Design a protein around this ligand. Sequence first.
Ligand SMILES: *[C@@H]1O[C@H](CO)[C@@H](O[C@@H]2O[C@H](CO)[C@@H](O[C@@H]3O[C@H](CO[C@H]4O[C@H](CO)[C@@H](O)[C@H](O[C@H]5O[C@H](CO)[C@@H](O)[C@H](O)[C@@H]5O[C@H]5O[C@H](CO)[C@@H](O)[C@H](O)[C@@H]5O)[C@@H]4O)[C@@H](O)[C@H](O[C@H]4O[C@H](CO)[C@@H](O)[C@H](O)[C@@H]4O[C@H]4O[C@H](CO)[C@@H](O)[C@H](O)[C@@H]4O)[C@@H]3O)[C@H](O)[C@H]2NC(C)=O)[C@H](O)[C@H]1NC(C)=O
Ligand SMILES: NS(=O)(=O)C1CCN(C(=O)N2CC3=C(CN(C(=O)c4cc(OCC5CCOCC5)nc(C5CC5)c4)C3)C2)CC1
Ligand SMILES: [Ca+2]
Ligand SMILES: [Ca+2]
Ligand SMILES: [Cl-]
Ligand SMILES: [K+]
Ligand code: NA
Ligand SMILES: [Zn+2]
Length: 805
Amino acid sequence: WTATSGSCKGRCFELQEVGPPDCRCDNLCKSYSSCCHDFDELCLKTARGWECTKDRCGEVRNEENACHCSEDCLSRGDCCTNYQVVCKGESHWVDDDCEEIKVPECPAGFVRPPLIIFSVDGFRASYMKKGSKVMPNIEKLRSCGTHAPYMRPVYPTKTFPNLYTLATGLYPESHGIVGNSMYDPVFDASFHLRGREKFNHRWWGGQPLWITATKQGVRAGTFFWSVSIPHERRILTILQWLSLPDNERPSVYAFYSEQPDFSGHKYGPFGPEMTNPLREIDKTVGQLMDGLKQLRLHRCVNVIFVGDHGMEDVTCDRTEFLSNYLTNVDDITLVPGTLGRIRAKSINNSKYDPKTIIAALTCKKPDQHFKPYMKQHLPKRLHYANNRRIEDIHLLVDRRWHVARKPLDVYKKCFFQGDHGFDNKVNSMQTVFVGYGPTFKYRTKVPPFENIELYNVMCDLLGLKPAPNNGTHGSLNHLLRTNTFRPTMPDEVSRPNYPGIMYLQSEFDLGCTCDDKVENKLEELNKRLHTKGSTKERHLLYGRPAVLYRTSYDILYHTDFESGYSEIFLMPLWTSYTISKQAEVSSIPEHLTNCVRPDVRVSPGFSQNCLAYKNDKQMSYGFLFPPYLSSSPEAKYDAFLVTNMVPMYPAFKRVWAYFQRVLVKKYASERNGVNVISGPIFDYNYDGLRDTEDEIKQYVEGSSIPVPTHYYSIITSCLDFTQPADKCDGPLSVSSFILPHRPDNDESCNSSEDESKWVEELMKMHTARVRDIEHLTGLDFYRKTSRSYSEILTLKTYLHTYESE
Ligand SMILES: *[C@@H]1O[C@H](CO)[C@@H](O[C@@H]2O[C@H](CO)[C@@H](O[C@@H]3O[C@H](CO[C@H]4O[C@H](CO)[C@@H](O)[C@H](O[C@H]5O[C@H](CO)[C@@H](O)[C@H](O)[C@@H]5O[C@H]5O[C@H](CO)[C@@H](O)[C@H](O)[C@@H]5O)[C@@H]4O)[C@@H](O)[C@H](O[C@H]4O[C@H](CO)[C@@H](O)[C@H](O)[C@@H]4O[C@H]4O[C@H](CO)[C@@H](O)[C@H](O)[C@@H]4O)[C@@H]3O)[C@H](O)[C@H]2NC(C)=O)[C@H](O)[C@H]1NC(C)=O
Ligand SMILES: NS(=O)(=O)C1CCN(C(=O)N2CC3=C(CN(C(=O)c4cc(OCC5CCOCC5)nc(C5CC5)c4)C3)C2)CC1
Ligand SMILES: [Ca+2]
Ligand SMILES: [Ca+2]
Ligand SMILES: [Cl-]
Ligand SMILES: [K+]
Ligand code: NA
Ligand SMILES: [Zn+2]
């Protein structure tokens, strides 16, 4: 109920939302059917439009007008945005040369530069170049401010997940808005685009910027605008709020445009019909900037121009139907479109089986335009699993396609030519970032970054302490002239032991053998030296990783590699080695095929054993430092130490062997050497975070050897590839992966072929940030470089994406 008989007189676009049954006058009242009777008349005036003409200059104030051109309008804060241009001989903001904003130039009583966030739905990254002739205001902000060539959204690349990620710094799995449509089985309630359930607060986790601001005494403009409030009025309302007295005036504002998404869905991302919506957004930007210029705020306010996601060409004829794969198509509920989420139609159906649904959707047609995954097997870079609202069964749909249950869903609902939601590394999904103002840099290009990082920066721009989030605070310091956040490296929690030779061969009863019984003072001191770390500078280039949790581990040195060996997990947490451009690849000699050797520095009790692998008919083993890259015959024996062995499914050893035998050398040749750090990951509860021992669900049969869910590698080299990886004087270049450790290669439809036809494609799909590995391992990398810590944080958030330009 709403008693709509109250009045909006003197309350238009009030900042504090009044509670039912009282009638509302705020920018959302329309969306709740709660505005007072007179809200349109008083608060949504339209008379005479949005622009001053010559003939209105100096007019007698008429309060019916949408905006004013009378002499008192600047003091009332309600001139039309072009008033000064038309009536006072001023130039439009866009026509002014750009001049560096070295310090905030604010009117008296402004405590801090305000922040205005201007968000554009569906604004694909390539619009900045392809539309540049029709967006002069936006192009000025872009070239005069700080810009990225694109900004990576979160998955799924849908509207509400991305806008709420922008607001919170959180992955959708953590904030809870995991799609535009959701079912929460605990609530037993459904969230949709249409309707009232979406306003209930329980969907929305984390702490969005407007709450963070409010808790720390920074006032926030209401961020949300009912769809029928036209853009011109939104801008006028922001500018009016900016003329409030100091104690009432917000410090942070938001404007949201439904365009160009709205037209993009209808016409495709580059339809001829898209030029006008881009023009109209630019004109809105021009209004805001002219309006700030009038208020003398144009060299005071920080403006962010940001998109939620891009737009791809998609038509109804490019739809895959589940009825063409599943027999039981009426026993499921599909969340459809540019991703798929599947669950049982009825919780009372005990004949529901995810495994048979997955098998029926796996590599069934030669051109199949989607791939099924149990959510835990999705690429970890998507961070799309740890929420009860994300269904176990997921379909990653190819760009340009849709998935639907049955053909009738597509015509009893062609219409549309554009859509989004695909994998967040897809080029068409990338979106935009521009920062302009005193706090941002002047005429600065920055590398692409993820939208999860922006919450921290928005907090920095307002002097707020961010709530805990998925950004890496400091990784975007290079966007800012001032207000940088100066983080320190986390403290190492566990120090390593440095064991020497402590055990005789015969103390081990591991069931292993090796043909290594073959015998020199010249080289005897040399091998001693190598076991004490004489080559450690070559193989550990960026310092040892810091262990950020309480555990027992040993540093083990070798000629060709160094490791941090966990006495709790019975395997290395990390293994570090450098392969130069000139390194040679060799075979595993015939006599050493099954060689595994006790490590006389590590007790039998803290060692794996070969017997467990012999008896576990499913599980085999591999090595972290590859025997193929041994520097000499003698050094190769180090690679068969029991302390370098890790459990691997035979199916996964095909992937791993190819990586180690072929790809490491290829990367070293291409990048002028590489440093590799590899290791295991345990994430059985798929939360993105290092498992403790008591979370491990699988061991090598009959043993306490835990089975990794994933294996990682971090591959680092010199950005200036004229310098070799191991003598690099400047910035670094990195690529990394987190490969799922799976007992089959069902994910790779061409896995019956030679590894050269499918392994690298798998690896590319599972590309990762160093930061993703940090979360999953509790390790902290790049502790000892010559580079600034903020640059290193930037490096750690880098994602090598493998898309063309
Ligand atoms: C990305 O960044 C985010 C933010 O930093 C990271 O997420 C955090 O990670 C922490 C570790 O996983 C997690 O900490 C736990 O919080 C428990 C209480 O949390 C509530 O309070 C906070 C503060 O306001 C709030 O933010 C939480 O909000 C969640 O839940 C509501 C719904 O209830 C959602 O609306 C909201 O979106 C959010 O959901 C997300 O997180 C929850 C987990 O909280 C997931 O289940 C959801 O799927 C979704 O992803 C909460 O309202 C706290 O009680 C925990 O303590 C347990 O663990 C400690 C270990 O120190 C143990 O010693 C204790 O005994 C205790 O265990 C007891 O409870 C167990 C669970 O029932 C039980 O089994 C035991 O036997 C014990 O009885 C713990 O500290 C933190 O909440 C989230 N924060 C957010 C916002 O998600 C995220 O990790 C980052 N991602 C990556 C990849 O880095
Ligand atoms: N879903 S779809 O098919 O693509 C299509 C459906 C039709 N769609 C459509 O008509 N609309 C969608 C829509 C509106 C109005 N909205 C908001 O006002 C809003 C702005 C906003 O800002 C956050 C800022 C944070 C800082 O960083 C900047 C952002 N957060 C939200 C929610 C996340 C809380 C909403 C969202 C209308 C447009 C989208
Ligand atoms: Ca959107
Ligand atoms: Ca975990
Ligand atoms: Cl969705
Ligand atoms: K075995
Ligand atoms: Na296969
Ligand atoms: Zn859309």
